[PDB]
């Protein structure tokens, strides 16, 4: 949800978070163990993002630079 105080939006869960970009790196790391990636895919699928194209695309829409992907 959107948490609001004195007309200032203080958090919105709708938005991709910068620290979740480091999760994109783990998914593309070829030498990272398959259980770690499955857990992350499940994390991003609980949020309604099912492919890495859907993940990267949501980060971009939310204002992040994703040009190294």
């Amino acid at each position: 949800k959107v948490y609001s105080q004195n007309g200032l939006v203080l958090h919105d869960d709708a938005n991709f978070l910068e620290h979740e970009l480091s999760y994109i790196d783990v998914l593309l790391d070829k030498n990272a163990d398959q259980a770690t990636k499955d857990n992350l895919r499940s994390y991003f699928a609980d949020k309604g993002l099912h492919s890495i194209k859907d993940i990267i695309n949501k980060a971009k829409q939310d204002g992040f630079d994703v040009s190294k992907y």
Binding site: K1, Y3, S4, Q5, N6, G7, L8, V9, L10, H11, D12, D13, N15, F16, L17, E18, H19, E20, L21, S22, Y23, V26, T36, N39, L40, Y43, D46, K47, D62, G63
Partner: protein, 465 residues
């Protein structure tokens, strides 16, 4: 009508109007912005309006972990099984973690130092960036979680991430309980009120209602009278730090850039331990950095926090001073004379009667903070009743209270009783010199300070499995 830019009174806006001869706001067609709190049952002409708490009432460290399952997950490091909270991926504080950045479309932290381009932080509560002193406390507890999880993984290697997280969280939660009830509240209420409102813990009572009462959201704002007009920062000699040792508060609201670029949380925590709070006096209630310049860097006009407090109490439909006095079993003054007796201050009584006309109409915060302070406490009898009663409920009505049988083992309870905020600071920062017990009373360097070496760490041996 956008309540932030408009002075028209239309739901949900209840703007504060400006008096004729106001010292700061010359223009009486202007106003102080105010959005009415969300009603529980919007649009009802049957229910008596009431407001919503978005947080768990329990002292469960929900400011760290969140109060809702999407945020709570989003705060976790999901790239491994270590049970860690997520940390900043761009910045570190001399090698230690910072809170992750939140992503807001309209981010107020970016409006403080425009050129620094440092956004607000993400934590279990959404107000974590409001002042850098608050940010530092959030950051401290972030680190304490991850330190605990790390120590526990070492001790119990076959524990998975879910397990590590829960156990660390359970420890951090008890640490907040202990610091609050053993160290903080006795200094709020004073001994007489502590023994009256918080007698010795017996056991969990499933019939005690642990909700936050509406009035407590206003009453506990007594803390606004403690606020100093500056943020103080100190180097490792506890001397002023030369990139601005004494920043005016109206230049630190949402100033997350100060934490990231002006030397991390160490100086800020030193400042908190080695600087006095402001004393509430009946003639010196609250400072102009919050009364005239609240949030002025991120917003069209500086707010008035005391005034907001009072408008909010009316928004929430709270009864006046005498009604809360009566609730507490305290005499109710009717005349200015009697109010003078209660306040031990006839002059202040006269000023209150000139504003309000009767003590029945005095807004709860204003009457509360006007009362003379209990011996060795920082509130009067009325606020001590409301705040005391609230924390009693939160304790006796909490099935996971740290001393409740079954929550921790006897050994774990023995070990938890060694914890203190000074030690937590030693464990998670570059500070090697910290306050003596009690951290909340100790305030002068070096008279009141000890080396970190002298303090016992938390022993986790009884968490082995």
């Amino acid at each position: 009508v956008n309540c932030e830019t408009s002075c028209v009174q239309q739901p949900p806006c209840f703007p504060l109007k400006i008096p004729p001869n106001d010292p700061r706001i010359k223009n009486q067609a202007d106003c102080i912005p105010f959005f009415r709190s969300c009603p529980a049952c919007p649009g009802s002409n049957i229910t008596i309006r009431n407001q919503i708490n978005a947080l768990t009432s329990f002292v469960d460290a929900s400011m760290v972990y969140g109060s809702e399952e999407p945020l709570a997950r989003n705060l976790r490091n999901m790239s491994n099984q270590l049970g860690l909270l997520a940390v900043n991926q761009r910045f570190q504080d001399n090698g230690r973690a910072l809170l992750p950045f939140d992503n807001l479309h309209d981010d107020p932290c970016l409006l403080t130092n425009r050129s620094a381009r440092i956004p607000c932080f993400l934590a279990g509560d959404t107000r974590s960036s409001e002042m850098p002193e608050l940010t530092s406390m959030h950051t401290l507890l972030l680190r304490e979680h991850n330190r605990l999880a790390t120590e526990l993984k070492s001790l119990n290697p076959r524990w998975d991430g879910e397990r590590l997280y829960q156990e660390a969280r359970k420890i951090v939660g008890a640490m907040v309980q202990i610091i609050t009830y053993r160290d903080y509240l006795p200094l709020v209420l004073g001994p007489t009120a502590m023994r009256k409102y918080l007698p010795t813990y017996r056991s969990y009572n499933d019939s005690v209602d642990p909700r936050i009462a509406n009035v407590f959201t206003n009453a506990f704002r007594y803390g606004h009278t403690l606020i100093q007009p500056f943020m103080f920062r100190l180097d490792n000699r506890y001397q002023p730090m030369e990139p601005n040792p004494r920043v005016p508060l109206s230049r630190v609201f949402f100033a997350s850039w100060r934490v990231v670029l002006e030397g991390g949380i160490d100086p800020i925590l030193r400042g908190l331990m080695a600087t006095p709070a402001k004393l509430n006096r009946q003639n010196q209630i609250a400072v102009d950095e919050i009364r005239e310049r609240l949030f002025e860097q991120v917003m069209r006009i500086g707010l008035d926090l005391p005034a907001l407090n009072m408008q909010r109490s009316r928004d929430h439909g709270l009864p006046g001073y005498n009604a809360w006095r009566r609730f507490c079993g305290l005499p109710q003054p009717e005349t200015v004379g009697q109010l003078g007796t209660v306040l031990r201050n006839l002059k202040l009584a006269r000023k209150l009667m000139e504003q309000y006309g009767t003590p029945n109409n005095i807004d709860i915060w204003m009457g509360g903070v006007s009362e003379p302070l209990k011996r060795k406490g920082r509130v009067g009898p009325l606020l001590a009743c409301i705040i005391g009663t609230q924390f009693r409920k939160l304790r006796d009505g909490d099935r996971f209270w740290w001393e409740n049988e079954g929550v921790f083992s006897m050994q774990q309870r023995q070990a938890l009783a060694q914890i203190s905020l000074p030690r937590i600071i030693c464990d998670n920062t570059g500070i090697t010199t910290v306050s003596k017990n009690n951290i909340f009373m100790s305030n002068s360097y070096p008279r009141d300070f000890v080396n970190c070496s002298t303090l016992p760490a938390l022993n986790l041996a009884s968490w082995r499995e």
